[PDB]
């Protein structure tokens, strides 16, 4: 039969891919990085606590400068904070209270947010009238929006509840490109240091690497066992990390198709909600559902510290472009900035 | 005011004004009570939402605002989404109650309704939210029972050995078979309700007809009991 023949061909192709990956498996990452000195203990203390959200926080994003920040809460609020002085610069109410994502334009002139409504709203910050307006409202998705990341002042990539991600055109409001390769809900995406490729993690335990200009998939990585809730790109742009519902963070490489290392522990049984890398990329910070965050030595899979105590499930985690501070927001109404001590 | 420039005090004043506006918004937010409506394609939740919207007055969500006894209720109904609920339902972990509409007169898909109730009740994040159960379409169920063509024992083999409990206060003027069937259907859901509730959250079984004007009062009373139990648990009384 044609159906059975196609399934057999697919199985043959998968076997060939696995055989090639095994052929390229010269030595493990853990074996190579074993004589390097361990980091030790990474003790980070809270410097600022930002209050003013009436409900759980779902998203957060630093500006290109390492000072201003934006956060989204399901009471229907988008609050911009000056982290140095804890001041509130803007407080934008939203048409829909259910907001699951938040973005900050690299130029600092725009913000974006989406949620259960299948609409991405872009708000203009620099107006001659002194108030923040709704610059654009992009519609066309048929599911809740999980993530959105700005490319320029006139381009943005969004991932929604359906299996598709889309690159839009803010000036015209129409999807310039559609990717439509996944099988489950896409939950996160990460832009490369040069914005030509980007990865997407979904609920089929697989990650996909797409080329923005051509709108096609390049590689598919499958090492996890459950839904992937977060993704972060390595600082050098040649690897990434994924966190899933199972208590595991997996590091995947690009030039070598296969997977590099696994970060897991016997005592951890909850899921990972967010991941991030430091400026050097040596440390990998992951927030968990047990109201905690862990710092893993990404080159040795050794836990080097715990950011402990947020009173509710940690939702979002980010690192400044300068690498000076780590911002963490949870299902509690608060956002905490953490920094090291000399 | 110490070591603060003339342009920093004004920024602090702007932040304080923003904070006072946030306080007013918090008061308004605490004033209203939020509910989450759930049902299948045959549940009939559209009729309930219409009757409680018009009388008491593409998009991924629908909002209905009503007011009973000077109390403001905000019901949220999911629409134009996919069939996988395991990801976007965790948003509704702070609602006051989950209204759950079940078509009782549909024996074939009753097991699906039981499975949905089981998955909602035992969820990790929805384990402290009470469920208001509306067993819609009682007239159709009574008509089907009176017809006698379809037997509940075919789908649930334990119905043949089930007898209606004594002192169950049957409605005067109702057929004994209809009362037995209704009590069995409510029994099937209260088993899941009391299987692992442990008193943290409770379920309120209700019977609803095709055109009933008392649904708002039922929701109001169930919400009153929910808030009363929450307040009792706060003071460690119970």
């Amino acid at each position: 039969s044609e159906l059975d023949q196609l399934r057999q061909e697919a199985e043959q192709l998968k076997n060939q891919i696995r055989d090639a990956r095994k052929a390229c498996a010269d030595a493990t990452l853990s074996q190579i990085t074993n004589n390097i000195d361990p980091v030790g203990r990474i003790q980070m203390r809270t410097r600022r606590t930002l209050r003013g959200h009436l409900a759980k926080i779902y998203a957060m994003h630093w500006g290109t400068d390492s000072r201003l920040l934006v956060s989204a809460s399901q009471d229907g609020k988008l609050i911009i904070w000056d982290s140095y002085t804890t001041n509130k610069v803007h407080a934008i109410p939203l048409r829909s209270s259910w907001v699951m994502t938040c973005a900050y334009a690299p130029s600092g002139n725009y913000v974006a947010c989406g949620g259960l409504d299948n609409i991405c709203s872009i708000y203009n910050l620099k107006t001659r009238e002194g108030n923040v307006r709704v610059s654009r409202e992009l519609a066309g998705h048929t599911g809740y929006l999980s993530c959105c990341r700005f490319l320029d002042d006139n381009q943005i990539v969004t991932s929604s509840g359906d299996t598709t991600c889309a690159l839009w055109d803010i000036e015209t409001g129409q999807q310039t490109t559609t990717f439509t390769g996944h099988t489950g809900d896409v939950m996160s995406l990460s832009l490369a240091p040069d914005t030509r490729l980007f990865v997407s993690g979904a609920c089929d335990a697989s990650a996909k690497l797409w080329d923005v200009r051509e709108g096609m998939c390049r590689q598919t990585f499958t090492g996890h066992e459950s839904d992937i809730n977060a993704i972060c790109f390595f600082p050098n742009g040649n690897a990434f990390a994924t966190g899933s519902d199972d208590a595991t963070c997996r590091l995947f490489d690009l030039r070598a198709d296969q997977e590099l290392m696994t970060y897991s522990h016997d005592n951890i049984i909850c899921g990972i909600t967010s991941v991030s890398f430091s400026k050097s990329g040596r440390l990998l910070l992951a927030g968990y559902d047990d109201f905690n965050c862990n710092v893993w030595d990404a080159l040795k899979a050794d836990r080097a510290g715990v950011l402990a105590g947020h009173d509710n499930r940690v939702s979002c985690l980010g690192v400044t472009d300068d690498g000076m501070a780590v911002a963490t927001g949870s299902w509690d109404s608060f956002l905490k900035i953490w920094n090291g001590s000399s | 005011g110490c070591t603060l420039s003339a342009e920093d005090k004004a920024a602090v004043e702007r932040s304080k004004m923003i904070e006072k506006q946030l306080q007013k918004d918090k008061q308004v937010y605490r004033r209203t009570l939020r509910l989450l409506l759930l049902g299948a394609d045959n549940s009939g939740k559209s009729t309930i939402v219409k009757q409680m919207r018009i009388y008491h007055v593409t998009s991924g969500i629908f909002e209905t605002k009503f007011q009973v006894d000077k109390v403001n209720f905000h019901m949220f109904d999911v629409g134009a989404q996919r069939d996988e609920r395991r990801k976007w339902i965790q948003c509704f972990n702070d609602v006051t109650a989950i209204i759950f509409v079940v078509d009782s007169s549909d024996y074939n898909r009753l097991q699906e309704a039981l499975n949905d109730f089981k998955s909602i009740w035992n969820n990790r994040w929805l384990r402290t939210i009470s469920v208001i159960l509306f067993l819609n379409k009682q007239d159709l169920l009574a008509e089907k029972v009176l017809a006698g063509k379809s037997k509940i024992e075919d789908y649930f083999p334990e119905f043949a050995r089930y007898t209606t409990p004594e002192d169950a206060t049957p409605e005067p003027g109702e057929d004994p078979r209809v009362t037995r069937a209704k009590y069995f259907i409510r029994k099937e859901f209260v088993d899941i309700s009391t299987a692992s509730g442990d008193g943290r959250h409770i379920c309120y079984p209700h019977f609803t007809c095709s055109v009933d004007t008392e649904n708002a009062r039922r929701i109001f009373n169930d919400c009153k009991d929910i808030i009363l139990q929450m307040n009792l648990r706060e003071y460690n009384l119970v």
Epitope: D245, D246 | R86, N122
Partner: nanobody, 128 residues
Framework: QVQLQESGGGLVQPGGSLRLSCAAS????????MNWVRQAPGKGLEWVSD????????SYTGSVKGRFTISRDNAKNTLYLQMNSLKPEDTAVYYC?????????????????????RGQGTQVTVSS
Amino acid sequence: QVQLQESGGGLVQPGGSLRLSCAASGFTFSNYKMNWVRQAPGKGLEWVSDISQSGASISYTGSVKGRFTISRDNAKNTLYLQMNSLKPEDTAVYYCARCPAPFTRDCFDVTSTTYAYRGQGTQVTVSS
């Protein structure tokens, strides 16, 4: 990488017997609850059986209780369903589904139209 392959099931006379097996790979079989679902011709996916992590808790759909028996072998990562005295209306495609998350007492979207953690299915035909 999560793969569930189902074997067994063919032409069976009414009152006959069958045994479907589901072999799992890519995940730790012992950490997940397992289910058997079915799709009848011209019908939606229907949950038919469920077995917990250690096999302590077992549930059926009621129309198969007393005829179907589910079991799991964590040592060999296998899921067995023994079907006894098949009715003529039992012709359907059977899928061995895995619950989405580990160490959970609830299972979501197992009978959804599409599902990443579901098998291809085996055809069970009852005729006379």
